[PDB]
Structure formats: C-alpha cells, structure tokens
Amino acid sequence: ARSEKRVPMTRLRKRVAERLLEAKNSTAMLTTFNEVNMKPIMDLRKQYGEAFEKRHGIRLGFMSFYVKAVVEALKRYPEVNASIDGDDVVYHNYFDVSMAVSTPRGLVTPVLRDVDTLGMADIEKKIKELAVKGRDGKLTVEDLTGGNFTITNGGVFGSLMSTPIINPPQSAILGMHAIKDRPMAVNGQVEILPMMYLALSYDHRLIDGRESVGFLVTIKELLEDPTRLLLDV
Amino acid sequence: ARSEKRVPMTRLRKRVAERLLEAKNSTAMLTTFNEVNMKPIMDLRKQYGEAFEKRHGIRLGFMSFYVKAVVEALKRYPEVNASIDGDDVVYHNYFDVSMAVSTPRGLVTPVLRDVDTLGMADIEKKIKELAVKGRDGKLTVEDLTGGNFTITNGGVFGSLMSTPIINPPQSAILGMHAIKDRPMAVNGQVEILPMMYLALSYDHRLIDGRESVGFLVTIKELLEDPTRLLLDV
Amino acid sequence: ARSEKRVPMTRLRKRVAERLLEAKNSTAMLTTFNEVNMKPIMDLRKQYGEAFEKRHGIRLGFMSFYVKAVVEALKRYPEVNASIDGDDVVYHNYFDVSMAVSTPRGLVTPVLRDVDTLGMADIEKKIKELAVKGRDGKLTVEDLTGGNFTITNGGVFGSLMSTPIINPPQSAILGMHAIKDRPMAVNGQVEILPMMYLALSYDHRLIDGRESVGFLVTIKELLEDPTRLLLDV
Amino acid sequence: MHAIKDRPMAVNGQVEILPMMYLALSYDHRLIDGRESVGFLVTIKELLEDPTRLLLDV
C-alpha cells in the first residue's frame, strides 16, 4: 500500500533541471505586475475578423497584437533588449522574440525572427507554422536558437497571475494570463470589463525599477488602444 | 541611546536558518496565484453546523474541506505528489499532507497521514489533536516526520496574499489567506462575495506551468462546489 | 543590420551587480502583500494643506505619513528592526529609515536618521534636502551609510504591484505603489476608492510569517486612520 | 478635400448629427475606369473613419 515508485531521470531531463537551477542562482530575478483592459482588441476581432480572414487567409488572433506591442516597447527601452556577456552589456539592435508553444511533452519556445518588419498577417502565419511543428514534435534546434525576449501565455490553462522565469542569456520575460471579467472603475462608474494581468520578470542587475515599470506601462497602453502604434504616442 | 543589543543564535536557531537558505538555493521555486469564492462552504457550515456537531462531537470547520480538495488534486496531478531524490523522481502513491499549526514559538508542520481514507469528521478530530499538542509544545519528532505536501494558512493573521516557501524534500506548498469581501462579476452583475486568494509555490525543475495551474484550478473548482467531490467532475 | 553593440561594464557597475547577486543568494527573501485605502490621508492634505504650508514653510506630502507609520510598526515588531551578523541577531533599539530618491542615474537610498523624534514638518524638510542633493548628484557616502529599514516608492512610475529586493545588511523592505481607483466593498455597498497595494519583502530566516503579516497589517491600519498614532491603538 | 460641416446622418436606424466632409476625385478616364475610381475613393473613406485599419491592413 504505502509504497513508492522510482523513475530515473533521463540525461536530457537532468540537463534541463540543472540549467534551470543555474539560471535561477545566476540572476537577480524580480517581478513587476500590471493589468490591461482587453475589450478594445476583442471589438477589433469582432468587427474585422471575417474581412481579415478573407483578405489574408488566416484569422486575426490576440498573439499578433502582443508581438507588435512588445516590439514597440523594446524600442523605447533598449535596456530590456540586451543581455550580459561576462563583463560586457550587449545591445542587440534587432528584434527577435521567443514565444512559447505547447508540444505533447510540455511548452517549448521557438523564435520569431526579425519581427519588426513583419505585418500582422505575417506574424499570425509565422506563429501557425511554429505551432504545427511544435505539436508535431518537428522543431529543429535552429528554430529554438534563442532570441532576445520571451512571451509566455498561461491563459490557455486558466491562470490568474504567476511569476514567470527568465530564459538565459535573455534578461526579461513577459507572462500573459487568463482574461476574466472584473468590475472596474471608469470615470466614477462601476463597469464590468474583460481584464488580464501582466507579469514581467527581469534581471535586476541589468534592468532597474524605472525601466521595468515603464516597459510594462507601455505594453498596457498599446494594447488598450492599438491606434497609438500608428501615432507613436 | 544609539546602542545595539546582540543575542547569539542557538545551535537550533542557526540550523533552521541554514536549512531554509539551502532549500532556497537548491530549488527553482515559482509561484502561481488564483482566487476562490468561499460563500458555498460558509452556507454549508451555517446549515449543517449544529447537526454535524451533534452527530460527530466536533464542529465542522474549513480545514476539512481544504484537505479533501487537496487529496483529489493530488490524484489528478501525480507530479505534484512527488519529489526528487538524486537522479530519481519518486512517485509516492499515497497521501500524507503536512499542515501548519501555531506553537507558542512559531508555526510548525505536523503530518496528517493517510488522509485519503479518512472522513471529514475524522480529519477535524485529527487536526484538533495536533493543534492541542502543538500549543502544548508536546509534538514528537515522529509527528513532524514530513509528508508529501504542505498546507499553510495565513488567514488567522489577516494576510491578503503572499509567497509561501517549499519545505524539502517536498516539491510544492499551498498557501491559504484571509477571507475578505470583494465585489465580483457574476453573470453580468456586480455582487459582493467573500473571496480568498490561493498561492501555490512549486519546484519548477519538477513541475511545469501546465500542472501548477491545473492543480490550482482543480482546488478552486472543488471548493466552490463540494458536490463535485461526489460526482468526480 | 543584425549587428550587436557591446559596452564594457565599469568597475562600479560590476560591483553593484555582484553585490545584488550575492545579496539575492545569501538571504531567503519572501514577499507578503496587502492593500490600503488612501482617501483618509488625501482628505487631510486637502483640508490642512494651506495651513500646514503657511505655518511650517513646506507642503504636507504623503511621505511624512509613511515614515510615521513605519516607525510605529518597528516599535511593535522589533524583529523587523534587526539584522543578522554572523552568529548573532542584532537588535538596534533605534530608528533609522532608508528612503529611495531618484538621481539622474537611477534610484539611490539615503538615510533618515533618528526619525522617531522628528515631527511631520521636520521629516518633510529632511526629505526635501535629500531629494535636492540626490537630483544634484551631491550625496556623500555618509548620507548613504545604511540604516535599519528601507522604503521604496514605485508609484511615481505608475506601478501596480511588484516584488522589492532587500538591501543588506537590512532584513526587510517596504514597497509603495501607484494609487488607483478601484471598486471596494464597504458595509455591503460598492464604493470606488483610491487604493494602493503594499509589498513587504523580508528575510525569512529571521522574520516569520506572523511578524511579516502583523507588520504590514499595522501599517495598513495607521494609514487608514492616522488618529490611531495619537491613541496608540 | 472640403469643409467639415455638421449634418444629420442615419446610424443603425437612429438620426445622429455628425461632422461630415465630402470627397471629390477627378481622374483621367482614358486610363482609370469607374471600378478603380470608386474603389480608390471607398478605400480612403474607410481608412479615415477607422485609422486602426491602417495597422490591420483590412
């Protein structure tokens, strides 16, 4: 009855475990949090969903909006788009974003490369290719060769809020969560809105509290009014 | 005036401090969070409190509901009911749950053993015995010989939300908090409900984001409708 | 196009990075959270702002209220006003509070010394001197010689909630955040209030969950009714 | 482009006063056909009434 069952870890399983622990102890990870109102994007999908699919051949999703917001944030705060290499701080000056996809054996993070020049239709198509290969277990090491910044999305599982973990040599990670209806204060009235928490884990020995808050405030602002991506405000 | 006072730490005090720090640095601890509506259980206590006491000789409390929810969650996600021993992942296949009780000199965690076969009346009686011995400082090392999972409750102190710390060799811990009235969105209306935050700290090198969120979603669901423990839904 | 830019870290920049990482790995940092209703203080500023300025020559701000609340909390929970020195726990028996100010090159934390004997007007004047020297980059090492407890304020940047980092040899830190309107449950009604989250990061190998929650509950209570500082309740 | 002037308009079965502007497109018919001229002017109308469509490319 009261008997255990032991399974030796594979050399792959142990190496992943060791790398995670070394990353944990080699970085001074801290986490900041915020909330974003998602109704403005849900309205856009509801209004232009069919026209977008008819013109481009792929559905308009939420992911394409997150990538554009992150790219603009990485332009305004370069220190988030950087990493430490020994004694040197390396500024990349280009925009590769890792994104987590679910394989049959857990989440893996392929890279969207040169995302600053893609359109929204291109991003959605590129994400679909990575998603299908990930589900098929067909991603190569080249696709997983890391970028500068990571987006992970725990909303599919129904998470409210959590602390994401950085993926070295990257210095920061953005965690998306479930969208849930909550009462909110709007111009002195109480209104129920679809709200989502944002979590940013960052390496404090490179990024300061000013930059982390400003980076996450920028993402909040661009998601609540995508027109600001056009105005650059 | 500006003078310090120094107290050498006892060898017991230092050993506890050292063990905590080693645990902190030997595990990749992360925390996920969620919220649970507690009114359904408060109604059950209000309706069946006297009948339960008259039949069983002990009052119906909240703790007996948390233990049953945790046991069902540990069945659905075995990876939370496991620990790492060197190169091996050990699956226990039995259900021992540690629970924190307040001694005169801080919290201590005796073990509820084989909680899957006990009824709610038995759990409440077993918790009362541990509580009285803990207050009396009369627990033996056998009672503190650890289990597989820990429940800690900071609600008595009035905490809103916090990050609990794992107790090795265990891999996860559940933190309960204070129950506080908050406005909530229910079917498009705003309703004030007694709400509690849940916090789960887990060792990421063993448990993944899917399992941690699913584990905490399961507990939320079972506490908001205990009848689901009967249906197994 | 896809070309990096490398900047060697100055010996000052590396030393700060190393000290932060050593602090991270040498302490068992945990964080508790709470929320405070700020309207009672905003009313006091609105009512007595002009009279206070006319009598004392300086404006009544929020910072003077936070310092008084912290000092009273440090009296009720001495274990927060302490640090570990090798094998000894050192109780300071005096009240020096570090406070973060923004320089042109990031936040720095000068010390308010013997804050228990100052009045609110004195605290505001002392904070203004440190603020001007910090903006001028004119603080000496004597001003930065650390105290017993730190207050950091991320509200100016617009942060909702975050995890602050301890500054050794200190054992705890208090993080203030942005004040934001939220609907709240008050005597069965829904009322929009200006609310702020509080975050306390503490060294668990010295401070226990009881003390951390009690310390943060005390601050919440004193800020929601400053008259309790007079009654000592 | 012309002056912006308030006019009553039909919006989802209601009458609402809106700031409206007329657009005029003069085109060389021996190169451009009626399809292109109308489509060109319809596109401008759509992008001005919701600039977010410049981001979506719809």
Author numbering:
A (entry chain V), B (entry chain H), C (entry chain A): 172 to 404
D (entry chain D): 347 to 404
Wording from the paper:
DLST is an octahedral subunit of the E2 component of the ɑ-ketoglutarate dehydrogenase complex (KGDHC), which plays a pivotal role in the tricarboxylic acid (TCA) cycle, converting ɑ-ketoglutarate to succinyl-Coenzyme A and reducing nicotinamide adenine dinucleotide. The complex has three structured domains linked together by a chain of unstructured residues, with the C-terminal domain being the catalytic domain where multiple DLST subunits interact to form the full 24-subunit assembly. Notably, DLST has previously been observed as a contaminant protein in samples purified from E. coli expression systems (Bolanos-Garcia and Davies, 1760 (2006), Andi et al., 2019).
During the assembly and purification of a novel two-component protein nanoparticle with designed octahedral symmetry (to be detailed in an upcoming publication), we discovered that a significant portion of the purified sample consisted of a smaller, unidentified protein complex, which also exhibited octahedral symmetry, as revealed by ns-EM. However, the predominant species observed by ns-EM was a smaller, cube-like particle lacking the distinctive spiked features of our intended design. Running ModelAngelo in this manner on our 2.51 Å Cryo-EM map generated 92 all-atom sequence fragments of varying lengths, along with secondary structure predictions that were in strong agreement with the density of the unknown nanoparticle. Following the Protein BLAST result, a pairwise sequence alignment using EMBOSS Needle between the Uniprot sequence A0A140NDX4 of DLST from E. coli BL21 (DE3) and the ModelAngelo-derived consensus sequence was performed. This pairwise sequence alignment excluded the first 170 residues of DLST that were unresolved in our Cryo-EM map. Similarly, AlphaFold 3 (AF3) predictions using the catalytic domain of the A0A140NDX4 UniProt sequence also showed high agreement with our Cryo-EM map (UniProt, (n.d.), Abramson et al., 2024). To generate our final DLST catalytic domain model, the DLST sequence derived from E. coli BL21(DE3) was used as the input for another round of automated model building, this time utilizing the sequence-guided feature in ModelAngelo with the UniProt sequence for DLST (UniProt, (n.d.)). 100 mM glycine and 100 mM arginine were added to all purification buffers to mitigate potential off-target interactions between our nanoparticle and DLST, which resulted in the near-complete removal of DLST in all ns-EM micrographs of these purified samples.
